Write a protein that binds this ligand. Structure first.
Ligand SMILES: Cc1ncc(C[n+]2c([C@](O)(CO)[C@@H](O)[C@H](O)[C@H](O)COP(=O)(O)O)sc(CCOP(=O)(O)OP(=O)(O)O)c2C)c(N)n1
Ligand SMILES: Cc1ncc(C[n+]2c([C@](O)(CO)[C@@H](O)[C@H](O)[C@H](O)COP(=O)(O)O)sc(CCOP(=O)(O)OP(=O)(O)O)c2C)c(N)n1
Ligand SMILES: [Mg+2]
Ligand SMILES: [Mg+2]
Ligand code: NA
Ligand code: NA
Lengths: 620, 620
């Protein structure tokens, strides 16, 4: 479809639109008493041209799967996003004045309770990665005509996550993706490092494989032309702008970031801007080509029960890869992402079987999470991203923002705990339960054998929110029958007798250490109840307390994790104040070191001998 | 001091050294049964030339403050680091064979229990940032002649944190810093994206402001010359290498990352390598110019007591900046870092008073933490880095690694909780207590007024480990006298009577909400004990239980944080099983939204009215 080269009246209408967007941005933030009108004003021509010349979308159905996508990476410009959706006819004009009120959904930064928002972007530097996932999905999965546009600030470009996304887009030839850089010279508290050195921005973009075009970001003409032209590779529109453009006395000045205009000033400036608008008539949005496919919303089921054998030995990391590949045969919705760790997480098994649905993300965990979030938007795919659980700490802000984005992504982190052995602490996840439990939409699976792992993968696929599966490096015995039923929030009692002295709660390697402790203790005529949580969040409080009441009130938790935020604290918080109930904890008390897995479990006090000693001390 | 242009015999000795380093790397990893000899072998000429031609250091005193610094960013090449320190005479040869044993300190990745290691680097992409802090310190603080050298992998370059460091180094003109890029074509599980496209690496480095030199990384001559030449700006030595160089049959092959050679193969390959060594005589290290200044190790004390007034209103974020500036007058060791948030965290006050000791880190939280870690190495400075607590989640892996690095850094995160109001959840720290409590070397301060904030800054300065100070946006009343004594692990009872019904534990805004609840409740003839923890980690368990025993065993915790990993869970874990003790929690149960601070405290159930209702329900 041809570029429509605008006439001078269309160009004037785009200028008028940009100026209306400035006025609203000022009105809304002055009404709120907070916000970022100067950050809106540098972007006003960009927004007018994108929404009212370049992009194709259903104005009354912002989530429509055929629409071009727009990602406001510089999310503090939210008031101008809201203004463009009022200009397009989706939002009521009057509602814009309710910015940041508890009575409104026009919140301080964009969030997906808004139909026109797919991802929340208030934490800078994350929007381009989500946009990359949207574009990858458009080109390779949906195979549709929609384009993806992402608006970034210049200060924002200091975030490394942006450059991971830059590199991803050129690796994967995302010629349907456009990044618009609002080079307004200034960040929050000082000039951005490169200021108006447009040539260095261009060199950086080009060095990372993008087609880079420098424009006057306040020229509607130049913007129409640069956006109109497609682009064989990801394209960066490097827009020279002025912060506070159009606000006399404030344009290009420090000390105005995140500062609203006082009422008296807003009124004077708005009259100035208004004087430059030549018509009140609004431009209409133009709709998309409807070529996005249907996607299935049904439950995704494993094609058969697990086929392990009780007593065989397999690491849950390897069971994860097996289970994920298996599930990929049941549904084309499943996609897998990994950060150059596929041979260690065993996501390589999925790649072997389903290569078209595997995304190599390289050593770039931040971006990997953002790609997954973008792929999950509009329910287009069901992503599973993997790396070592320790390296998901590199992506915690992306995970945090994924929950604010109401995203349905699945994360599998391997190599938990000291039981990995010889690599040492840099590779050992000892804080991942703390991390993921603190994510408000999370479900935390900690499968203890291959059967439980397969069941966790299936359950995660069908569970909303941030699903985390903690996998382990040691081979451990299969303990569950293949037809054992598993559910979110349902634990399992894996050993019991009527004379049990203590309820021992373990998971992964420490479950197996607890079972081995039970055998040690049998020699002493001491029986212990052993409980496998299955999910750490939510925790089966009922079965834990029913168990504890059968074992003189006594609970011992043992975990390959630090003391804070893990299993022991979850249990303690669940049962505190319950009459007659006591909880004793065994966990890892400090940064570990290299050695054999069994040696480290011993050193850090979480192996079978440590468990047996704690049990005896409770009995006395 | 002149470049010493080596003769052919010195060059042959450097080749011999490189080959000895290969042999040891193989021997050690084969002995261990794990490790990364192919990653060592690509770097062997680089290591030989750096340690035995270019760098200047005391071989018997690796931590000496005058020494050049070397940072092994690609930390899985640890065996070749160990080998070079044995070659230099510091380590015993025989100890190299004890790699990864629980009986050795030659662990799988480098750690600072090793004298020759300043920062732990097992999580890729972090070493260059630490090296930047070392170089910044050398040039601007120590004003010394030492240089800083950092060896990176090519896959590693996919991490965004590397590019933040690249940009930092050119902003700050770190002409004493050299990055060596081991472009061996391969990552862990596939070729690195750019493979041997040396020109694109050069363009990326140059676009980020570095002087970039492409070399044959297996030519000792070319390396000597490129390292010899200083360099007016940060310099990237872009070394074309082959993974597994020198291992016949393995050089340049996939499927060998992190795979040790079997014994039979190691023996054959070592005989091959050994055959190419022309002399056993070792080269000696060359010592540094001793021009690093003395640094003071004494306690750092505030120059006076706090000068607040009880009843005056100040936000703890603003008290932080005031206190940090004050402390900077007492000692030149204090430095401040911030990520383009200085006007919102109030670190701008320190910048105003002590500009030479403020480091603007721009919107790049990962790198900021790494700069701080590097500045703290060898005790050269006492860093305080600040941003919003929510954005420290962007740096969790750097923080995690800082504890593995035994680093003494101070972090102040503002804008905690829903009480920030209108910006919404992207800015709200609701998981920072979970995060920082899980860091094993951490001390977590949560000051509730300006006095407590000043005391926390002073205590943090003098406390080892990862110190976190949680600051808040609302102005709240000063409640403490200026001469109130504060200590790590000591809480305060701020309201009590002999007829108290409940012990209410709050902090920051929720302390003030609890005090307001106490006034509400007085109307009903209900008294409550109110306790301010001061430190969340470590928690004053004794005062909490003594308090609870005075209030019928009843504890209510109220926090502007999610339920998991915060104050309520810390308290529950501390007191679980204590007879007669109950704990009830109020926290934030889901992702928040925009509104006024008081409105959000109400919506999320943590304001004075919520507290008063929970107290009444306990009494019944
Ligand atoms: C990951 C990350 N780091 C730092 C920031 C902080 N930040 C921004 C805001 O958080 C808005 O999103 C900031 O304004 C706060 O709203 C404000 O500090 C609150 O102030 P208070 O009243 O004191 O509480 S925006 C920003 C600068 C971005 O510059 P840019 O990319 O050049 O964009 P421009 O605005 O010029 O177009 C910074 C540092 C965030 N959010 N994320
Ligand atoms: C932040 C981050 N992300 C990913 C990785 C993983 N990783 C590396 C190791 O972790 C070593 O540090 C990895 O080998 C593990 O030791 C190994 O997977 C364990 O295997 P197991 O036996 O299955 O348990 S190293 C690496 C590739 C680096 O490539 P490069 O930069 O090009 O360096 P080169 O080796 O060629 O010189 C990856 C992905 C880490 N660590 N950090
Ligand atoms: Mg800007
Ligand atoms: Mg490599
Ligand atoms: Na899910
Ligand atoms: Na400290």
């Amino acid at each position: 479809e041809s570029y429509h080269k605008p006439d001078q009246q269309k160009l004037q209408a785009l200028k008028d639109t940009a100026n209306r967007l400035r006025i609203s941005s000022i009105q809304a933030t002055t009404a709120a008493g907070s916000g970022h009108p100067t950050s809106c004003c540098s972007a006003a021509e960009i927004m007018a041209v994108l929404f009212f010349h370049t992009m194709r979308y259903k104005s009354q159905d912002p989530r429509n799967p055929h629409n071009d996508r727009f990602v406001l990476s510089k999310g503090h410009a939210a008031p101008i996003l809201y203004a463009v959706w009022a200009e397009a006819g989706f939002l009521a004009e009057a509602e814009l004045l309710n910015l940041r009120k508890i009575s409104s959904d026009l919140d301080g930064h964009p969030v997906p309770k808004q139909a026109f928002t797919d991802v929340a972007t208030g934490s800078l530097g994350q929007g381009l990665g989500a946009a990359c996932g949207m574009a990858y999905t458009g080109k390779y999965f949906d195979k549709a005509s929609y384009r993806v546009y992402c608006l970034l600030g210049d200060g924002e470009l200091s975030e490394g996550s942006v450059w991971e996304a830059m590199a991803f887009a050129s690796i994967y030839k995302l010629d349907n993706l456009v990044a618009i850089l609002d080079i307004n010279r200034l960040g929050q508290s000082d000039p951005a490092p490169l200021q108006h050195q447009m040539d260095i921005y261009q060199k950086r973009c080009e060095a990372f494989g993008w087609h880079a075009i420098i424009v006057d970001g306040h020229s509607v003409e130049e913007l129409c032309k640069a956006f109109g032209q497609a682009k064989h590779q990801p394209t960066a529109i490097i827009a020279k702008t002025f912060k506070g453009r159009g606000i006399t006395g404030v344009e290009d000045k420090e000390s105005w970031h995140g500062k609203p205009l006082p009422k008296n000033m807003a009124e004077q400036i708005i009259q100035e801007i208004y004087s430059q608008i030549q018509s009140k008539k609004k431009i209409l949005a133009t709709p998309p080509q409807e070529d996005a496919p249907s996607v299935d919303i049904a439950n995704i089921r494993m094609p058969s029960l697990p086929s392990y054998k009780v007593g065989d030995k397999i690491a849950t990391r390897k069971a994860y890869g097996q289970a994920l590949a298996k599930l990929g045969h049941a549904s084309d919705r499943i996609i897998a992402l990994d950060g150059d760790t596929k041979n260690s997480t065993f996501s390589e098994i999925f790649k072997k079987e389903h290569p078209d649905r595997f995304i190599e993300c390289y050593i770039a965990e931040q971006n990997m999470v953002s790609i997954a979030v973008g792929c999950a938007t509009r329910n287009r795919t069901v992503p599973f991203c993997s790396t070592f659980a320790a390296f998901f700490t590199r992506a915690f802000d992306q995970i945090r923002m994924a929950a604010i984005s109401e995203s349905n992504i699945n994360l599998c982190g391997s190599h938990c705990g000291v039981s990995i052995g010889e690599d040492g602490p840099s590779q050992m996840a000892l804080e991942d339960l703390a991390m993921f439990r603190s994510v408000p939409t999370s479900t935390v699976f900690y499968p203890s054998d291959g059967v439980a792992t397969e069941k966790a993968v299936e359950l995660a696929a069908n569970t909303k929110g941030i699903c985390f599966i903690r996998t382990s490096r040691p081979e451990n015995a299969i303990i569950y029958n293949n037809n054992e039923d598993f559910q979110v929030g349902q634990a399992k009692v894996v050993l019991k007798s009527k004379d049990d002295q203590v309820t021992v709660i373990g998971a992964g390697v420490t479950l197996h250490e607890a079972l081995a402790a039970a055998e040690l203790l049998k020699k002493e005529k001491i029986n212990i109840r052993v409980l496998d949580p299955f999910t750490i969040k939510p925790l089966d409080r009922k079965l834990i307390l029913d168990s504890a009441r059968a074992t003189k009130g006594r609970i011992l938790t043992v975990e390959d994790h630090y003391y804070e935020g893990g299993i022991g604290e979850a249990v303690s918080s669940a049962v505190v104040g319950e009459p007659g109930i006591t909880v004793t904890h065994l966990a890892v008390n400090r940064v570990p070191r290299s050695g054999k897995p069994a040696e480290l479990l011993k050193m850090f006090g979480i192996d079978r001998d440590a468990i047996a000693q704690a049990v005896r001390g409770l009995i006395t």
